[PDB]
Design a protein around this motif. Structure first.
Motif, PDB file in Angstrom:
ATOM      1  N   UNK B  44     -49.949  -2.284 -20.234  1.00 43.71           N
ATOM      2  CA  UNK B  44     -49.854  -1.480 -19.020  1.00 43.71           C
ATOM      3  C   UNK B  44     -49.257  -0.105 -19.281  1.00 43.71           C
ATOM      4  N   UNK B  45     -50.024   0.810 -19.865  1.00 46.27           N
ATOM      5  CA  UNK B  45     -49.604   2.203 -19.939  1.00 46.27           C
ATOM      6  C   UNK B  45     -49.496   2.803 -18.551  1.00 46.27           C
TER       7      UNK B  45
ATOM      8  N   UNK C  82     -46.862 -27.444 -28.695  1.00 49.37           N
ATOM      9  CA  UNK C  82     -46.805 -26.046 -29.097  1.00 49.37           C
ATOM     10  C   UNK C  82     -45.802 -25.830 -30.217  1.00 49.37           C
TER      11      UNK C  82
ATOM     12  N   UNK G  17     -42.886 -21.091 -25.929  1.00 51.17           N
ATOM     13  CA  UNK G  17     -43.916 -20.480 -25.097  1.00 51.17           C
ATOM     14  C   UNK G  17     -44.906 -19.729 -25.968  1.00 51.17           C
ATOM     15  N   UNK G  18     -46.121 -19.560 -25.466  1.00 54.22           N
ATOM     16  CA  UNK G  18     -47.089 -18.727 -26.145  1.00 54.22           C
ATOM     17  C   UNK G  18     -48.035 -18.016 -25.206  1.00 54.22           C
ATOM     18  N   UNK G  19     -48.138 -16.689 -25.305  1.00 54.10           N
ATOM     19  CA  UNK G  19     -48.943 -15.910 -24.375  1.00 54.10           C
ATOM     20  C   UNK G  19     -49.790 -14.873 -25.100  1.00 54.10           C
ATOM     21  N   UNK G  20     -50.986 -14.609 -24.561  1.00 55.40           N
ATOM     22  CA  UNK G  20     -51.984 -13.750 -25.190  1.00 55.40           C
ATOM     23  C   UNK G  20     -52.546 -12.793 -24.145  1.00 55.40           C
ATOM     24  N   UNK G  21     -52.587 -11.499 -24.494  1.00 55.32           N
ATOM     25  CA  UNK G  21     -53.277 -10.475 -23.704  1.00 55.32           C
ATOM     26  C   UNK G  21     -54.763 -10.816 -23.665  1.00 55.32           C
ATOM     27  N   UNK G  22     -55.330 -10.888 -22.459  1.00 56.87           N
ATOM     28  CA  UNK G  22     -56.491 -11.748 -22.267  1.00 56.87           C
ATOM     29  C   UNK G  22     -57.729 -10.976 -21.826  1.00 56.87           C
ATOM     30  N   UNK G  26     -56.807  -2.760 -20.933  1.00 64.06           N
ATOM     31  CA  UNK G  26     -55.956  -2.205 -19.871  1.00 64.06           C
ATOM     32  C   UNK G  26     -55.930  -3.087 -18.626  1.00 64.06           C
ATOM     33  N   UNK G  27     -55.391  -4.293 -18.763  1.00 67.07           N
ATOM     34  CA  UNK G  27     -55.547  -5.280 -17.703  1.00 67.07           C
ATOM     35  C   UNK G  27     -54.445  -5.162 -16.662  1.00 67.07           C
ATOM     36  N   UNK G  28     -53.395  -4.411 -16.971  1.00 59.05           N
ATOM     37  CA  UNK G  28     -52.331  -4.111 -16.029  1.00 59.05           C
ATOM     38  C   UNK G  28     -52.042  -2.627 -16.099  1.00 59.05           C
ATOM     39  N   UNK G  29     -51.361  -2.095 -15.093  1.00 58.66           N
ATOM     40  CA  UNK G  29     -50.963  -0.694 -15.098  1.00 58.66           C
ATOM     41  C   UNK G  29     -49.631  -0.570 -14.370  1.00 58.66           C
ATOM     42  N   UNK G  30     -48.776   0.318 -14.860  1.00 58.66           N
ATOM     43  CA  UNK G  30     -47.491   0.605 -14.244  1.00 58.66           C
ATOM     44  C   UNK G  30     -47.517   2.027 -13.722  1.00 58.66           C
ATOM     45  N   UNK G  31     -46.544   2.368 -12.891  1.00 59.80           N
ATOM     46  CA  UNK G  31     -46.417   3.706 -12.348  1.00 59.80           C
ATOM     47  C   UNK G  31     -44.973   3.942 -11.948  1.00 59.80           C
TER      48      UNK G  31
END
Lengths: 49, 49, 94, 98, 98, 41, 49
Positions: B44-45, C82, G17-22, G26-31
């Motif tokens: 998230x840029x 896991x 835990x295990x997490x992957x950008x999916x 650019x699946x999220x954006x901040x401001x």
């Protein structure tokens, strides 16, 4: 009670009443918004040592 | 001791273990949400760029 | 300093009457609390106490993470093995 | 005389009367008539809060479940009022002649 | 959004009952509703293993309600009351306005 | 708090979130105890 | 993992835990949409070599 002094009986009824500041938070902030009148004016009084 | 108090002091250590264990299992239910934002702010840029 | 007074509501129902009557100052150096009234006093009548007026023990809102807005952004699938993975992949053909 | 005052001087007239819980401050106010409040030495209320925690990952200190136990005391501030009956008045209208 | 319904009774009568009489004047202590908590510490004494799941007691069937003259305003999310008491309980007296 | 057996009955619920802040710096008797304790028993 | 301690017994709880950008890109954006406070005072201090 009753006064045996004249002018009536006139004695005082009194009630006791206890309270606790309730809430771990802040609980009833108050806000100050308006000016009615300055109790002292911006005056010209010199300091007299 | 089997007396009236030593039955009770057992119960006070049970409620702590119950409300210690209710918190930390709920902590991963809160730690899941905290794991969101520190990898979603790996991506998230900003919108301006 | 002193023990917590005498309790006057106690021994309005006395558990035993003393079987022998003496002058009490003959063993004055024996007792711990001692009060020798003159046929009435003012402290025979007053009562006093203090009260715990009810506790307040909050219950924290047990938040299911699905019962929260942010779990539509994320998939959440369990994987009870896991700790034994060491490598993993998703393939992504486009 | 109070048998008439329970009928007349106890209710059935306002002319300028307020009830407190009529008024809408009472949502701030718990109100409870504790009649033996003169006899108390102290008045205690215990609060207990149970602060939750969050699991933190990696090279960090470990979050321990904390509890907080606390008590308060009441405050008295013994309230007064003021009353004045008049001579040739209360005795005359409460059974001293007539 | 005016004319709220309020509770008329001074909420509660914490009076010295059969438990709070004998506890107060003899043991020099009291507890609010020792009738309740004297039963709850013995009910979970026979069968325990926690619950906890309680405010340790509450039930009695109703508060009494009376609709009264009032003003309710809508600020933000909350339905906040609004009051000013210079006309109600402070007119022509000698108490300064707080 | 100062008395433990009265706290086994909740006599109401607590609804706040305050830490060792204001509510703790207002009390006559506060005891901040970690999950392991000895004087509780 | 009941390991030990002094003054009690510590149970710790690990949850892997295990997490992957999916998404692809650019699946999220901040401001940044506001400023809370300036942390530093703005200067007037020279570098002392």
């Amino acid at each position: 009670a009753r006064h045996e002094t004249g002018g009536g009986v006139n004695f005082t009824l009194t009630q006791p009443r206890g309270n606790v500041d309730l809430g771990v938070g802040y609980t009833a902030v108050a806000a100050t918004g308006t000016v009615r009148n300055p109790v002292t004016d911006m005056g010209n009084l010199p300091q007299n040592f | 001791d089997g007396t009236g108090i030593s039955l009770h002091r057992q119960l006070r250590a049970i409620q702590q273990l119950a409300r210690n264990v209710q918190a930390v299992l709920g902590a991963f239910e809160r730690g899941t949400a905290d794991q969101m934002l520190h990898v979603l702010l790996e991506k998230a840029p900003p919108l301006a760029l | 300093r002193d023990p917590p007074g005498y309790r006057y509501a106690a021994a309005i129902l006395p558990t035993g009457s003393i079987l022998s009557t003496i002058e009490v100052a003959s063993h004055r150096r024996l007792f711990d609390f001692f009060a020798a009234v003159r046929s009435d006093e003012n402290s025979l009548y007053d009562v006093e106490f203090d009260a715990l007026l009810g506790s307040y023990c909050n219950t924290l809102s047990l938040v299911r993470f699905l019962e929260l807005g942010l779990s539509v952004a994320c998939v959440c699938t369990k994987f009870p093995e896991l700790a034994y993975m060491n490598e993993g992949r998703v393939q992504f053909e486009v | 005389d109070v048998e008439f005052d329970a009928l007349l001087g106890s209710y059935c007239n306002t002319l300028s009367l307020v009830r407190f819980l009529e008024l809408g401050l009472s949502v701030a106010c718990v109100c409870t008539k504790f009649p033996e409040l003169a006899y108390m030495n102290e008045g205690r209320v215990q609060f207990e809060v149970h602060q939750p925690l969050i699991a933190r990952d990696g090279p960090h200190p470990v979050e321990q479940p904390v509890h907080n136990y606390m008590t308060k005391v009441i405050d008295r501030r013994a309230l007064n009022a003021a009353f004045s009956l008049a001579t040739e008045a209360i005795a005359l209208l409460t059974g001293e002649a007539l | 959004e005016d004319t709220e319904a309020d509770v008329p009774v001074t909420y509660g009568e914490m009076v010295l009952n059969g438990a709070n009489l004998v506890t107060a004047l003899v043991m020099g202590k009291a507890v609010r509703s020792l009738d309740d908590v004297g039963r709850h510490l013995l009910d979970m004494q026979e069968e325990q293993l926690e619950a906890n799941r309680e405010t340790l007691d509450e039930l009695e069937s109703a508060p009494q309600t009376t609709r009264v003259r009032a003003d309710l305003v809508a600020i933000g999310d909350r339905l906040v009351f609004l009051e000013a008491l210079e006309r109600r309980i402070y007119a022509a007296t000698n108490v300064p306005y707080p």
